[PDB]
């Protein structure tokens, strides 16, 4: 299938350059157009520019006309991005997407967030929320882990490495001192916890890591 | 730069009803091959977009058929017929016929459905926290509807307002319901000075509060 492995996190110095890049896979490269999309959080979605990789031809959004330089790699089917004098307007999801015939974006990457600030890259701790001894469960109980002390965005949270996914609620982070919390909590029927195992994973790709934790009673 | 209008900004829709997503563009944008290169997206809640519709009123392969495009000139539409709860999210229209490519406003499909009460599960720092000088206390609320509703804290029977921060889940995919944290961090310090820890969660579909409270026995 058609396919955009992204760079996933990124954290920068105002004033810096960084580089993104979008390894295509499941169609042949050089046929096709790719292109970059900006989302700032909460914001909508704004076209940067294209490159076709087949003669390296490039166009632009003019707004990024000093800001973005596309290029490409035939060999490794990769597209970049590099984004020069980086400033908090620049924090944003980018996304690479392909554009076929008669039509766009038919399949987009997963987004590269960029962060911009002077602040350095933190991975989580992270947290069991289990009930209180004496707590009476009806038929389901509640259960989560605590992303606490990160940055930059995002964290991603997995239950049972997927395999979970009926009843998990992951809430909107939160920001507190130049640090992100979120959590993560899953429902399952009181009968089968602790019983049965039940893992959280969570991701934090600006520092590479996933954390895998068994979450048991207190 | 050709500027795509739409509206409404945002769109409550009971399941199984009809939404009606307008997109007006600045000026014409029909290319000079004839075709007009207006499409239709979709983004989830933290997923990519999707695409839906292209020149217009054309379905994009495995697209359900209760979605449909229309329009000319500069004035479009997107239906979607016999709303399900996961077309929840973000719908854009685009035009790819003058650089730069535009992307509209965005429209918010939002599900409206029956009132929902919360569950409430209170959970007290975990004694792995300890160690990093702050303790947690987290409130949870589960499944509920609307997304408005008021979280109170109380410390041994005194209510308190520093130090607590709120997170909401988007809309379920599948109940339709919300869910929140309220969680109150603490130091270790002041955590370990008191004895009852009480979130009350008040929504509009009882008058009665939910109180879940522990203490470190």
């Known amino acids: 299938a058609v396919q955009f492995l992204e760079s996933g996190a990124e954290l920068a110095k105002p004033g810096a350059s960084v580089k993104m890049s979008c390894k295509a896979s499941?169609?042949?490269?050089?046929?096709?157009?790719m292109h970059w999309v900006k989302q700032r959080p909460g914001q909508g979605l704004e076209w940067i520019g294209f490159?076709?990789?087949?003669?390296?031809?490039?166009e632009y959004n003019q707004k990024f006309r000093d800001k973005a330089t596309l290029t490409a790699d035939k060999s490794s089917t990769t597209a970049y991005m590099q984004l020069s004098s980086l400033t908090s307007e620049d924090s944003a999801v980018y996304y690479c997407?392909?554009?076929?015939?008669?039509?766009?974006?038919?399949?987009w990457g997963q987004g590269t967030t960029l962060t911009v600030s002077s602040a350095t890259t933190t991975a989580p701790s992270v947290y069991p929320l289990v009930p209180g001894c004496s707590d009476t469960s009806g038929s389901s109980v509640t259960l989560g882990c605590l992303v606490k002390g990160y940055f930059p965005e995002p964290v991603t949270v997995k239950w049972n490495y997927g395999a979970l996914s009926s009843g998990v609620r992951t809430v909107s982070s939160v920001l507190q001192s130049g640090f992100y919390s979120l959590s993560s909590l899953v429902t399952v029927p009181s009968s089968t916890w602790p019983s049965q195992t039940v893992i959280c994973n969570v991701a934090h790709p600006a520092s590479k890591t996933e954390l895998i934790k068994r979450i048991e009673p207190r | 730069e050709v500027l795509m209008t739409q509206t409404p900004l945002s769109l409550p829709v009971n399941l199984g009803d009809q939404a009606s997503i307008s997109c007006r563009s600045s000026?014409?944008?029909?290319?000079?091959?004839?075709?007009?290169?207006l499409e239709w997206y979709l983004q989830k809640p933290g997923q990519s977009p999707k695409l839906l519709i292209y020149?217009?009123?054309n379905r994009f392969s495995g697209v359900p058929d209760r979605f449909s495009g229309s329009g000319s000139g500069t004035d479009f539409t997107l239906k979607i017929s016999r709303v399900e709860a996961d077309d929840l999210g973000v719908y854009y229209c685009?035009?790819?016929?003058?650089?730069?490519?535009?992307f509209g406003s965005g429209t918010k499909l939002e599900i409206k459905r029956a009132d929902a009460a919360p569950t409430v599960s209170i959970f007290p720092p975990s004694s792995e926290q300890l160690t990093s000088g702050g303790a947690s206390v987290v409130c949870f609320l589960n499944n509920f509807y609307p997304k408005d509703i008021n979280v109170k804290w109380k410390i041994d029977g005194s209510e308190r307002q520093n130090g607590v921060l709120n997170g909401w889940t988007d809309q379920d995919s599948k109940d339709s319901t919300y869910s929140m944290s309220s969680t109150l961090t603490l130091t270790k310090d002041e955590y370990e000075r008191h004895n009852s820890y009480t979130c009350e969660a008040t929504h509009k579909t009882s008058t009665s509060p939910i109180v879940k409270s522990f203490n470190r026995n």
């Open positions: 997407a392909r554009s076929f015939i008669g039509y766009n974006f038919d399949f």
């Open positions: 490159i076709s990789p087949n003669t390296d031809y490039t």
């Open positions: 020149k217009v009123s």
């Open positions: 685009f035009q790819g016929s003058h650089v730069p490519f535009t």
């Open positions: 499941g169609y042949t490269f050089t046929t096709y157009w």
């Open positions: 000026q014409t944008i029909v290319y000079s091959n004839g075709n007009t290169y």
